[PDB]
């Protein structure tokens, strides 16, 4: 009879990809999340051909990458795909997140909360293993981040030395940071396998905000092809960036081999943290400052129950659409501030962004959603 | 349209289409041919044999498109479906093999005697899983 519906393995994939009711208006924006999956398989795969060669020797580490990006076949390609294919996995995140604050996508409490955890794990693996190319930026950011968690009144003294294996970076540290990279990765994949289990049993959304069980089309021939087409469009831009102008997104200060004898003049991390580092140094009081740094990834779980409108999505809410575009411009000025020395207006101005990322979505957005409820009589 | 068409429309229809040689006089049973022809010549020959108005239409070979129609009406008990493609004409010699081919699929209704093992491969499955009320070709 029909083999597609009686075999124990193919029931699972027919019910999951080939034959699930799907809406029909979905914006391309429903596109990006799959792209992330493509990135996930490529960061893992390309990243094992480096731990094959690399050597966790504190006075052997830096020359290791230097011989791989010279010595072996095609290694110059793979090094750069690994360094650039996560400048874009971090591109994907800010779009897949910001959309869910447009099309009312948090009312999925279960889906939404197994999210933020993944945000935290992915954001920490990259720092935890950008300090083991073993260069001055790598050591001198490690020292600075390390000295903050040590300002806990009774916590700090003891925890700090357990990760060093001593007093300062030696053979006892590079080894256990290289311990870290291997395992955060595998664990993360299992949290992504559970994000979707929730997704079955509520079905997807649609960019109007009205349940449409009336007209659901399949997810074979349509979503399968749209997806393949856009995916083979991510491999144009990725490869053009890497094989035309690789050196564009980096810094020329992981080339002098690590020394305690020098100290970099204008230390600053890559672009995609300078946002959760501009709050930090914006304020005095080190113990407090660490707390305001994590107020942010936990600002988010606090925003399903501040909703105060009667409708879903901003499509039919033309007055709230103003406040959503002063959020992203805030996050752009706040990234222009950070990677730059301290001068007269930088302190005064970066301050406003810190005050406002909070006044927009803490006071304003729940109090400006009633002024318009009062206008359509709900 | 069955609310407006009046006496004049009907009388020219009857004049323009009911005429010879578009007609056939057929009989069967215990009839005699010569007597039938004699009786035909008396009552029928007062008839207009030359074409009136010379209204000769030209045959247009038929177009055939691939469309699909769907009507919802959720409160009925059962659902009806039909599917078809293009075929030959009356005088085409390809009709006999298509008859021989359609007789192999068959027919079935849920009151037949010996279902669930009757020779067609489609009838024998509907009888045993109980999917059909009926089907035909």
């Amino acid at each position: 009879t029909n083999i597609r519906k009686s075999h124990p393995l193919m029931k699972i994939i027919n019910n999951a990809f080939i034959d699930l009711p799907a809406p029909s208006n979905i914006s391309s924006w429903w596109n990006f999340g799959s792209l992330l999956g493509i990135c996930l398989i490529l960061q893992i795969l390309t990243g094992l051909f480096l731990a094959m060669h690399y050597t966790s020797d504190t006075t052997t580490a830096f020359s290791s990458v230097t011989h791989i990006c010279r010595d072996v076949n095609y290694g110059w390609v793979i090094r750069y795909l690994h360094a650039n294919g996560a400048s874009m996995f971090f591109i994907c995140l800010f779009i897949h997140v910001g959309r869910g604050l447009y099309y009312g996508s948090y009312m999925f409490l279960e889906t939404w909360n197994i999210g933020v955890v993944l945000l935290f794990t992915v954001m920490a693996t990259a720092f935890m293993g950008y300090v083991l190319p073993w260069g001055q930026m790598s050591f001198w950011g490690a020292t600075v981040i390390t000295n903050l968690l040590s300002a806990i009144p009774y916590i700090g003294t003891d925890l700090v030395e357990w990760i060093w294996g001593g007093f300062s970076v030696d053979k006892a540290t590079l080894t256990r940071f290289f311990a870290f990279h291997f395992i955060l990765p595998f664990i993360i994949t299992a949290l992504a396998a559970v994000h979707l289990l929730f997704l079955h049993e509520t079905g997807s959304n649609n960019p109007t905000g009205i349940s449409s069980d009336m007209d659901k089309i399949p997810f074979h021939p349509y979503y399968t092809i749209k997806d393949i087409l856009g995916a083979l469009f991510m491999m144009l831009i990725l490869l053009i960036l890497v094989l035309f102008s690789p050196d564009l997104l980096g810094d020329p200060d992981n080339y002098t081999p690590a020394n305690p004898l020098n100290t970099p003049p204008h230390i600053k991390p890559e672009w995609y943290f300078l946002f959760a580092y501009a709050i930090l140094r914006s304020i005095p009081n080190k113990l407090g400052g660490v707390l305001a740094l994590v107020a942010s990834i936990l600002i988010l779980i606090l925003m399903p129950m501040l909703h105060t409108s009667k409708q879903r999505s901003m499509m039919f809410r033309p007055l709230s659409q103003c406040l959503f575009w002063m959020l992203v411009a805030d996050l752009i000025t706040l990234t222009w501030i950070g990677g730059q020395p301290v001068e007269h207006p930088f302190i005064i101005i970066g301050q406003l962004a810190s005050i406002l990322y909070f006044l927009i979505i803490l006071v304003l957005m729940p109090i400006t959603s009633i002024i318009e409820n009062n206008l359509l009589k709900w | 349209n069955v609310r407006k068409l009046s006496r004049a429309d009907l009388t020219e229809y009857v004049s323009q289409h009911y005429k010879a040689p578009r007609m056939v006089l057929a009989a069967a049973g215990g009839v005699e041919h010569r007597q039938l022809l004699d009786l035909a010549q008396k009552h029928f020959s007062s008839l207009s044999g030359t074409y009136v108005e010379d209204a000769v239409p030209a045959f247009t070979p038929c177009r055939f498109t691939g469309s699909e129609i769907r009507h919802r009406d959720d409160a009925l008990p059962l659902a009806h479906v039909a599917i078809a493609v293009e075929g030959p004409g009356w005088a085409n010699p390809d009709n006999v093999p298509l008859q021989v081919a359609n007789a192999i699929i068959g027919h079935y209704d849920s009151t037949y005697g010996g279902g669930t093992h009757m020779s067609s491969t489609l009838a024998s499955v509907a009888a045993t899983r109980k999917l059909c009320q009926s089907f035909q070709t």
């Binding site: 034959d19 049993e201 009336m214 411009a329 752009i332 000025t333 101005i349 | 691939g66 769907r70």
Partner: protein
């Protein structure tokens, strides 16, 4: 348990459709692409720009002022 058999209930409606092989897939693309964008960009050019417009001003102000007090310090470094 929410496949294509059991969902919402609707009644008295009808829809029509052709095949793909009896049609062409470019019905005046050139002469209908432009007017849609013309009519829609106007509506939301006003809803994405002005929030973004007040960052150019502050960025240029700060840049040029800091450039002054870095390249032209010897103006107020009075002897």
């Amino acid at each position: 348990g929410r496949e294509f058999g059991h969902l919402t209930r609707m009644r008295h409606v009808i829809t029509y459709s052709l095949s793909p092989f009896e049609q062409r897939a470019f019905p005046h693309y050139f002469t209908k692409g432009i007017p849609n964008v013309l009519r829609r960009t106007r509506a939301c050019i006003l809803r994405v720009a002005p929030p973004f417009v007040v960052f150019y001003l502050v960025y240029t102000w700060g840049t040029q002022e800091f450039e002054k007090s870095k390249r032209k310090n010897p103006a107020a470094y009075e002897n």
